[PDB]
Symmetry: C5
Subunit: 307 residues, 5 copies
């Protein structure tokens, strides 16, 4: 049996699918299905059971057994970078994670969780998995950062696998529910299907991210499960590409449309990463040697799936 | 003693009536009577006691005894296909059901519950009670689907009856409270009694459902109780009929009126089943061999009862 | 010691007064004094103590002793016929009553409670205390009906007094707080003192009720306490009188005014009793043989007290 | 150690000051400081500790010790005569008081509490501390009345001091927070300092009250503590004076202004005491023989303190 | 291990930084991160863990251990002088503090907490740490005052360090979140960077405060920890300077701008301190002999850090 928190969300559901593809269906999904439209992400998948995040937490803290648990993929989190309720953020992200971590540690259950490249918080190089390089620009980022710091305290003493994946800009199938937190690829696709103009922020000529395909993210997750290695690892392609590149791949698929520039949103000024590029040294050194899909490859594959 | 959850609702109250007709009155109804107008559905019936769904759940989970329970007909659920609070849906439908199921299993109490053909989610044939054919279009459907999947895990090991009825489009007496979730028959009748025009969705020429009379649904329920067979079974006539057919039967009774087409509601686009027809192979194979009332028969009988 | 629930309400306060008149002042009143203006109903009376309905219930269910309890007059209920929250109605009326009943039963405390002729729900004769004749038109009525049904299950086995009084149209002193649930007598009086026209519903020419004076209701209550007889008994004059009769008695006292007809309120259409007349066969057979004040007598006595 | 509930309120804070003046500072104040502006009433005083009314109650009911308690002055209450939530009133005034009383009784702690002349409810003479003369005109008054009645049941059996002070119209320093429940003296003063006209109700020519200075009220309280006598005692000057008299004393101090008559407020019609005058027979008979400051004396002393 | 409550706030975060500078990183921060923007204050620091104030309190009161606690710096409080909810203020400031104090006392954990010069409440000299000189002008001040009074009762009997720092007008890095409670220095800086005019209250010519640099405040805190001395001590420079002086230092750095006078805000009239100057006699006598940065020094250092 495997547990996937955030299992009805974007990355989580993709981990579920990947597990299904390996013939594993004995999965417990933990999520918050308040936004019911998220069911789409599970409808075509095969799981054993579903539990709400709040119930799960209660049971975790009471020390309930869930049977023979092989791993927890902890993808569940408040994922909005524009959420400013720190109380909620620190409870739901940081505290929640701590609580899970301890539960796993005590039962020697492999624990594989989601960090974020938001922890790097705006810099132009050296995106390296170490405290010196970390300085989040928002409370979301802070909640992730502090957890990584917590994990770092625990690692030397741990008797079972602990892995944190520092995801960069993930995109692909099963993020339709993320609204304004959905990938630019997604937004452009839906704008184009609506006969609207595809929109980019003002200054996106100079904005670059490490855009990584969700399929690859899933593969990395399973690989680490199979291999047992511990640590905190960047997860991206290693190549930074401009938003313009993403737009290109998208318009190319749709055979139409032309980019329009909207004002840079006030609520992100000072909170924004203008450049990210994953340094994959540690990742490779851990033994994960598979290549990553480029924006051209990933976006077109995604576009096909969206239509 | 028999327990009927959703007992003040449409199908539940009809099960109560059917039990009354067999001389059984030692019934506990579990429901949520917040909408007080639902009392009409019980007023002319004979029951032993009434309990709110929330109290019932608490007692179930505490392992209270209710006396000598012969069966639970679990018809209680949030039945709105346009309810999008997934948290509520999964608690009140899925979790609730699990909780009941376990309670019954442990005491070897026959458990007969409501599934839904919404689990098939829009396809043009092969409405067969098996996972390959299931793909709900909304979270309501998902909550039903996942429970059936759960039941499927339990069945091989079960020591007492477990039956799920996959109801198609049920209509007849005691659904007045269902508002916009009430049968089209019901809506047309009340429109006509109000001197308004009888209304159908745009494109209903091509929309067909397996419309099944509530009386038959009740009979099936009791039959299964008496016969002890387990499984998940489609419950419909086996014949798909157009909404136009329903309208015909109705206008014929009222001796007046002409169909008006209203816009297809935005909130259902992408969430809608355009065709359903129950495959009754498993149902028949279980031994239930009685015929089902056609739309012509059922609707006219209903119309008489409404007036 | 005697307990009167609804003790600050109309009928309850009158039971208190009646007890006072017999030299009994060791009374605990249970009510919900949220509407503070209800204090008037107790101000001139003599009681031992006051408790809120919610606290009372908690203590009842915990099995607290209140000292040496001689009887509970259970007049407390949500008494509005236009309240449509069934959840609340069934908790506060039905469940609450059950809870009291059991408490009394276990301690062999005489339990005398309020039913309602609303249980008959609109019929033109045979207002007899038996299930065949009962069919309430609203959820208030349902909550009363179901409790009577519950009492009926308990009666054959009971070792102490259980009595339910099925009050018809009660009127008299101490109902000023009941707003639109107050007697027509009351409304007419206040309309006339305000220089307004006295108002009756459209079609009141054909509306008749068994109007019974509150003083008589109180007497019946005490009589049953003294005599120990069990059962469910109609409580009204046995004579149906038109609303016109009530108006006559009232205008006669005030020496002025002329009836005006207002529209029949939408919220009561289909929910309304057009005729009631208590069949006093069981009541008389139990041994209560005293006469009841007519509308002419009762209304004029009331009018004097109001001025 | 001494406890003063309502200690941050008008009368309570004055009791604190009086205790300070006798060299006693080991005081626990219990209040509800939601309206923070009430802190002024304590700022210049000396107390040992502060507790919220809700916490206090919890601890009382749990039977916590507070150390060596010498007395409780129970001045805490919802003091608004225009508050019509009876549920709250009866909990916070009546029930709360009962709870304290029992706590004290059990530990033989002298209990000195606040009643009110509102219990007399509008009469033109015989303001005597006995049930025949009591008939409050509002639920505030009722809550006080019923408690006095409760105390009366307890008194013959009590082994420690119980005293209730039936305050008439108290005025003086430390009532600035009472808003529209503040003394007329206070209102006139603030109207005059605002260059507005000093306002009296229409018909105040014929309205008289027993206006008593807060300083005297405090003295009475301490006297009873020192002397140990039990009972319920009127506390006022024994002389009724018109509102006009109060106005006179006030305008005289301010050397300006002329009375304006505003409409008698709707919300008080039928709820209003037109005359009060304390009968001090019992008070004197208990041994308290000190004189009371007249309106002329009291108001001018107050006016000086206000400026 | 060290605990810093209010650790994400202004003074608290500076204590954290100071601890970091001494090589201490084993810190638990307790705060309320509801306003997420406060994360900035911790982002560049090194702590062991984070806990919400409400959870912390629960655990404190349950008597949980946090490991080997060396000290608690209790800087956490509702710090707004214009918050008028006294209930909240007394719970969150006074009660909370008491609760911590007892926890520490019992485990002999050095307890170092924040008082306030607001306790002096407007006077023109003798700002001495003694009750005669204390008279707060608002409920915030009251909550601090009462706690100091409480500490004073405890001190003679205490077996471990208790220190309260009566901070005057603190200013410097990490107060950006304090909005209108932020230093005038801060406000002027942000006004100037916005091309607006730097604003001072009307009458600031005659307003002087003891402005003290946050760096010094931090030093004092650590010094007391190292030295073990107990008591309540003023913490300011000992020199009063006008707001004009602060403005001067600021405009001098920015090389531009001219002071504009805005109306004195209504909500502060009667609640305002016009003059403060710390008397450092006790502070020096305790042994703390280091000098304090003047407004000229402090403000310019701050201005550099802000830019
Ligand atoms: N998407 C990216 O590009 C990316 C990049 C870097 C990091 N990440 C991180 O990776 C994880 C997955 O991201 P995502 O894109 O899949 O986000 P997502 O689509 O929103 O998936 C997360 C789901 O988990 C729920 N959730 C929140 N807190 C939970 C908890 N404590 N336990 C269980 N479920 C919880 C969310 O709902 P509610 O918040 O409404 O309760 C949501 O349904 C998140 O931690 C995210 O921060 C993602
Ligand atoms: N009528 C159809 O065409 C049809 C078709 C397929 C399936 N079904 C299913 O068969 C059952 C009967 O449906 P229906 O048409 O009779 O709907 P319904 O009239 O609304 O009956 C359900 C009643 O039970 C209540 N309820 C909800 N959750 C409950 C719970 N956990 N325990 C007990 N009662 C609960 C509902 O109120 P609240 O949610 O507001 O609390 C309602 O009063 C439902 O499960 C429904 O999904 C019906
Ligand atoms: N007067 C009539 O024409 C007549 C006729 C037939 C039957 N009855 C019945 O006689 C009883 C009293 O009637 P009434 O006219 O005297 O009504 P009433 O004036 O409204 O008095 C009832 C009082 O009891 C309170 N209450 C509600 N639930 C309670 C509970 N569980 N325990 C204790 N008190 C509770 C009510 O407040 P809240 O509900 O707001 O909390 C109200 O203050 C009711 O059951 C009523 O249905 C009266
Ligand atoms: N001064 C008069 O004219 C006068 C005349 C006759 C009788 N009295 C009585 O004398 C007492 C004090 O009167 P006052 O004029 O000083 O009124 P006050 O200034 O309003 O004093 C009462 C204070 O106690 C608080 N409180 C309420 N319930 C409490 C409780 N259960 N325990 C502790 N504190 C509580 C009140 O706030 P909240 O209600 O907002 O919670 C308020 O702060 C009251 O019982 C009053 O009814 C006064
Ligand atoms: N800054 C000055 O010139 C000066 C002057 C006078 C007094 N002080 C005192 O110094 C202390 C801190 O000052 P500051 O300038 O750093 O103010 P601050 O920035 O507001 O720091 C206090 C922080 O702690 C939080 N908090 C509130 N109650 C808490 C509790 N019980 N436990 C833990 N955290 C809590 C506050 O949030 P929430 O209130 O929203 O919950 C806030 O984030 C306060 O006690 C303050 O009164 C400083
Ligand atoms: N440039 C541009 N253009 C257009 N659009 C856009 C851009 N950018 C961005 N965008 C959008 O918005 C949003 C926000 O952004 P940000 O702030 O940057 O965030 P991001 O990163 O991008 O995303 C996020 O992330 C995170 C982590 O990292 C996660 O968790 C989440 O979920 C998300 O993904 C965005 O979203 C877009 O749409
Ligand atoms: N075509 C047409 N026309 C008209 N009308 C209509 C149509 N369709 C539909 N409709 C209406 O609306 C509503 C909704 O529907 P739906 O979404 O589709 O749903 P249904 O299926 O129909 O019904 C339902 O079902 C279910 C299952 O199956 C149940 O549960 C519920 O309750 C219901 O019944 C309807 O209702 C109509 O009215
Ligand atoms: N005819 C006429 N006119 C005028 N007014 C009136 C009439 N009728 C009636 N009314 C009024 O409204 C109300 C209501 O109605 P119902 O629903 O029917 O109610 P009833 O029965 O009469 O009364 C009631 O009752 C009950 C039981 O039986 C109780 O619980 C309640 O509380 C009441 O009493 C009436 O009220 C009148 O005012
Ligand atoms: N005459 C006159 N003029 C003017 N103003 C007035 C008068 N009277 C009165 N006022 C006013 O209003 C108020 C209230 O009144 P009442 O309702 O009457 O009340 P009193 O008695 O006066 O006072 C009260 O008391 C009580 C006890 O008894 C207490 O608790 C409260 O708090 C109060 O004090 C008055 O105040 C004035 O302003
Ligand atoms: N003379 C002044 N000129 C401009 N702003 C002021 C002045 N005095 C106070 N303020 C602003 O108003 C706020 C509140 O002041 P006050 O209530 O005296 O608290 P404090 O003593 O903490 O400054 C301060 O944080 C500051 O931003």
């Amino acid at each position: 049996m495997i547990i996937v928190t955030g299992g009805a969300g974007f990355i989580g559901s993709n981990i579920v699918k990947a597990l299904n593809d390996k013939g594993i269906t004995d999965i417990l999904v933990v999520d918050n299905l308040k936004d019911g439209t998220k069911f789409v992400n599970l409808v075509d998948l095969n799981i054993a059971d579903y539990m709400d995040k709040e119930d799960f937490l209660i049971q975790i803290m009471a020390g309930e057994e869930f049977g023979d648990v092989e791993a927890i993929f902890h993808e569940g989190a408040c994922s909005s970078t524009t959420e400013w309720d720190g109380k909620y953020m620190m409870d739901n992200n940081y505290q929640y994670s701590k609580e899970l971590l301890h539960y796993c540690l005590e039962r020697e259950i492999p624990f594989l969780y989601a960090s974020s490249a938001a922890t790097y918080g705006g810099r132009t190089s050296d995106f390296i998995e170490s405290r010196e390089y970390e300085k989040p620009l928002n409370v979301f980022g802070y909640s992730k950062f502090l957890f990584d710091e917590y994990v770092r305290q625990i690692l030397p003493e741990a008797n079972s696998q602990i892995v944190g994946f520092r995801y960069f800009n993930v995109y692909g199938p099963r993020e339709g529910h993320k609204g304004s937190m959905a990938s630019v690829a997604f937004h452009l696709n839906t704008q184009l299907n609506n006969g609207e103009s595809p929109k980019l922020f003002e200054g996106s000529e100079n904005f670059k991210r490490d855009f990584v395909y969700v399929g690859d993210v899933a593969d990395v997750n399973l690989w680490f499960l199979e291999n047992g290695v511990s640590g905190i690892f960047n997860l991206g392609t290693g190549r930074a590409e401009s938003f313009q590149a993403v737009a290109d791949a998208t318009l190319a698929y749709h055979k139409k449309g032309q980019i329009e520039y909207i004002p840079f949103p006030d609520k992100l000024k000072g909170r924004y990463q203008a450049f990210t590029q994953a340094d994959l040294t540690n990742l490779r050194a851990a033994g994960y040697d598979k290549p990553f899909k480029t924006v051209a490859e990933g976006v077109t594959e995604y576009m096909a799936w969206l239509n």
